[PDB]
Design a protein around this ligand. Structure first.
Ligand SMILES: O=C(Cc1ccc(OCc2ccccc2)cc1)NC1(C(=O)O)CCN(C(=O)c2ccc(-c3cccc(Cl)c3)cc2)CC1
Length: 266
């Protein structure tokens, strides 16, 4: 109903804007650059991950068009879920490294390539392990995805959520202390953009997860879980907003983005 239609509109607009921005940014990064120290590599991989999320969005949009009905199987459903989170976590780790990298400057290249390549292999490995468990179980083909599921007998799965939510806080914690130390004019202003994106899109999402996981391992009334279900779907949209806050971040990290954007606007 109302929740479905607001999600449809928000997802449509976010997909369009993110697609345009990521396409332009990826074109500029791929077709102009010859020598890259570390920032170009980091921003290129961030652009690729954003492109992945943008290409994943239309399936969820179509799902919300059809009044919450799924008719394409289970494998596609789990592929969509896996890709969405996967991009969420890649974006949190590679945005961490840009700050850590952009602090030694104020206070070479082969090391940044090593870290950059490791992240993609572990994300790819985690993609495969979700497919294998889907085929093995091979359960009845239910028509209900993107919906609340209970984990009363699946406490191990709650541990997957439990590890991530706490681990995100250390990454958020270290970024704060890094800024405090730092807290040259251009460098200081730019690094403040990293904190803006990190605090708006991602910080709210993990905070409410404590209540969400708490209701999972507990008995809940009819009123309670409906409100929790209402909150999470809206709460995910805020996390998916990083696809459009990243393009403005490209603008302040390099002049090539600035020059092409200036050419297009002028
Ligand atoms: O960026 C990543 C990969 C990563 C790689 C290395 C890391 O440190 C090593 C390292 C760090 C810095 C430098 C050098 C080395 C840390 C993370 N992120 C993942 C993770 O390891 O934290 C998490 C998402 N991920 C899934 O496979 C995945 C999970 C959960 C779901 C899911 C959850 C709920 C519902 C549903 Cl349906 C699905 C889906 C997929 C990839 C690995």
């Amino acid at each position: 109903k109302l929740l479905s239609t607001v999600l449809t509109t928000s997802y449509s607009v976010i997909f369009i804007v993110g697609l345009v921005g990521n396409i332009i940014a990826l074109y500029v990064f791929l077709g102009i650059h010859r020598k890259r120290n570390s920032i170009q590599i980091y921003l290129l991989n961030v652009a690729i991950a954003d492109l992945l999320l943008i290409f994943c969005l239309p399936f969820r949009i179509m799902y919300h068009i059809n009044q919450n009905k799924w008719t394409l199987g289970v494998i596609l459903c789990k592929v969509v879920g896996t890709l969405f989170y996967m991009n969420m976590y890649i974006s949190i780790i590679l945005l961490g490294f840009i700050s850590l990298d952009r602090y030694i400057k104020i206070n070479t290249t082969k090391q940044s390539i090593y870290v950059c390549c490791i992240v993609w292999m572990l994300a790819l490995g985690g993609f495969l392990t979700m497919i294998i468990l889907t085929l093995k179980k091979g359960g009845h083909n239910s028509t209900m995805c993107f919906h609340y599921r209970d984990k009363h007998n699946a406490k191990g799965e709650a541990i997957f959520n439990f590890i991530l939510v706490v681990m995100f806080w250390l990454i958020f914690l270290l970024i704060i202390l890094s800024y405090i130390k730092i807290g040259y004019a251009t460098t200081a202003r730019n690094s403040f953009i990293v904190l803006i994106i990190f605090t708006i899109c991602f910080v709210p999402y993990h905070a409410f997860r404590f209540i969400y996981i708490s209701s999972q391992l507990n008995v809940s009334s009819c009123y309670w879980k409906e409100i929790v279900h209402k909150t999470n779907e809206i709460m995910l949209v805020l996390s998916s907003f990083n696809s459009c806050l990243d393009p403005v971040m490209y603008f302040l990290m390099s002049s090539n983005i600035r020059k092409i954007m200036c050419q297009l606007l002028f």
